[PDB]
Design a protein around this ligand. Structure first.
Ligand code: HEM
Ligand code: HEM
Ligand code: HEM
Ligand code: HEM
Ligand SMILES: O=C1O[C@H]([C@@H](O)CO)C(O)=C1O
Ligand SMILES: O=C1O[C@H]([C@@H](O)CO)C(O)=C1O
Ligand SMILES: O=C1O[C@H]([C@@H](O)CO)C(O)=C1O
Ligand SMILES: O=C1O[C@H]([C@@H](O)CO)C(O)=C1O
Ligand SMILES: [Zn+2]
Ligand SMILES: [Zn+2]
Lengths: 225, 225
């Protein structure tokens, strides 16, 4: 229980450092934020993605395993889980729309890269996990048998999409650093290169912590009567 | 059992398509292979990495869950598991040495990228899982209690390193396509862009299949007496 406390502690810390490093990076090293820059608008993409898709979803994934909720309502924890994932969906759609906007405005191509393919798959599958999850596990009419055999799929899919999102983030960082750090070139180890690489590792470690927490059987929410 | 057969079937298929797509890509679209090209030598990197690190390790990770081995020796299955992971280590070290060689020969920088940071971490941790795994679980002198509490770490770490390796592969593809596809630019959807993006997705799906297989409790190797 207290070693769980230390794990949730570390996960929260690394996660918040991921968001801080995202913000510091776009504000300091890049040009900033804004709703038309146009790269000012683009840099909403990494910031949103880290914030909702990696961090908020990272937390939503393990919301049920907090002990101070075990004797809380299941319908309430379903509400927190659904809603937290929902904030993360909204933010990720906003983040993808930002890129489609900066690109259509600036006459760049869409969906040519592997980062966008994987990314868009993870987004679509995230909304399918959200819709099925909401129309089976929150909603009332779904027969208990349908919950019974959707559940292992739904847990697995959640972990898979989480990982895929981490992998797409690291691909995103790479694309941005290679495109942007031309002179000083990325190869020359410039300050933004080390800073962003570190943010990468933080996003990675945070994934590792969330996976550890979420795969302890001794911290699963104790089964309902 | 037969739905397991179909899963191992699909995993093997997608895995072999990953290796085929790697080879077709470096041989067709790039310049080829060789032990001094110098990019001929480099293109050993993706090919080796896909082959040993993604595929051979993908198989080693689920070797114990094949039913036709459940009433086989545990020491034998430990041998296959160890040895398969060992082939994958050898190949991955060869693959990293290839890059350090092409780069030192051609005066490029080392370890400036996030793909190399994560990649090198995954390699070091893969050799630490290999050494600890070999000096606890194959070797005789390790007290059963030390196996008892190393095991959940060791399973977790294996799954984490597998995923990290998948993420580093996708980062690698991205780097290579962005560096190499200058004219026709990657953005222009050239044939190699679609082919390699597809190889990316195959590497991804293969990871998903291996994770599904390896997290079915009904396919864990039945515990020793
Ligand atoms: C993109 C959206 C979602 C993702 C990534 C996701 C992910 C997950 C994950 C990873 C778990 C395993 C947690 C654990 O066992 O500790 C889980 C459990 C669960 N999820 Fe979701 N989920 C999503 C949407 C939803 C929605 C909308 C609902 C609606 C009620 C829902 C209901 C549940 C339930 C009931 C559990 C079982 C909790 C337990 O007793 O351990 N999920 N989810
Ligand atoms: C991890 C979750 C992420 C997802 C799911 C995701 C998804 C996407 C999608 C669908 C696109 C295509 C948009 C378009 O074609 O206009 C895109 C573009 C892009 N993203 Fe991400 N993204 C993520 C994170 C990041 C991060 C953290 C960065 C950091 C800089 C980044 C950098 C880029 C860049 C440079 C592009 C345009 C180049 C391209 O089309 O590949 N992405 N992303
Ligand atoms: C990089 C090297 C390695 C990786 C990635 C790795 C990965 C894994 C994974 C993912 C599992 C879980 C499989 C399952 O539960 O179905 C596992 C199980 C196991 N591994 Fe390893 N392993 C490595 C090295 C070794 C070595 C050298 C040994 C030496 C004997 C070993 C011994 C075992 C044992 C005994 C099990 C339990 C099998 C069972 O009864 O289910 N591992 N390994
Ligand atoms: C997935 C497992 C992989 C691992 C663990 C890995 C690891 C590494 C390491 C440690 C380096 C640094 C070598 C040096 O600095 O000279 C490197 C470089 C490189 N790798 Fe990978 N690699 C992997 C897969 C791939 C794949 C599939 C490609 C496909 C083209 C690729 C493309 C590159 C490129 C272009 C470089 C040089 C640029 C750089 O330093 O980032 N890698 N890799
Ligand atoms: O609706 C639900 O389904 C799961 C599980 O019981 C499925 O077997 C769960 O925790 C609910 O409250
Ligand atoms: O976000 C991007 O960065 C590069 C380039 O615009 C930098 O000048 C690019 O092509 C993107 O899509
Ligand atoms: O050496 C071993 O340790 C594990 C497990 O028993 C640990 O509890 C296993 O399968 C062995 O043969
Ligand atoms: O493997 C590589 O591809 C590019 C470049 O060499 C292509 O001309 C680069 O810098 C690498 O390290
Ligand atoms: Zn852009
Ligand atoms: Zn090179």
């Amino acid at each position: 229980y207290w070693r769980f406390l230390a794990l949730l502690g570390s996960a929260l810390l690394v996660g918040f450092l991921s968001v801080i490093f995202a913000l510091v990076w776009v504000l300091h090293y890049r040009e900033g934020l804004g709703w038309d820059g146009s790269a000012l608008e683009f840099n909403w993409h990494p910031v949103l993605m880290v914030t909702g898709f990696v961090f908020i979803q990272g937390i939503a994934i393990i919301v049920y395993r907090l002990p101070w909720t075990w004797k809380c309502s299941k319908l309430l924890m379903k509400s927190i889980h659904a809603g937290l994932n929902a904030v993360a969906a909204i933010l990720a759609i906003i983040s993808v729309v930002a890129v489609f906007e900066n690109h259509n405005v600036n006459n760049i191509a869409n969906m040519y890269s592997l980062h966008s393919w994987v990314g868009l798959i993870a987004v679509i599958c995230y909304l399918l996990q959200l819709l099925s999850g909401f129309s089976v596990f929150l909603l009332p009419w779904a027969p208990l048998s349908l919950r019974a055999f959707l559940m292992p799929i739904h847990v697995y899919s959640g972990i898979v999409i989480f990982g895929t999102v981490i992998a797409t983030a690291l691909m995103g960082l790479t694309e941005k650093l290679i495109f942007s750090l031309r002179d000083p070139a990325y190869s020359t180890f410039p300050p933004e290169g080390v800073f962003v690489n570190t943010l990468g590792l933080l996003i990675l470690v945070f994934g590792a912590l969330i996976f550890w927490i979420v795969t302890r059987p001794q911290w699963k929410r104790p089964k309902e009567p």
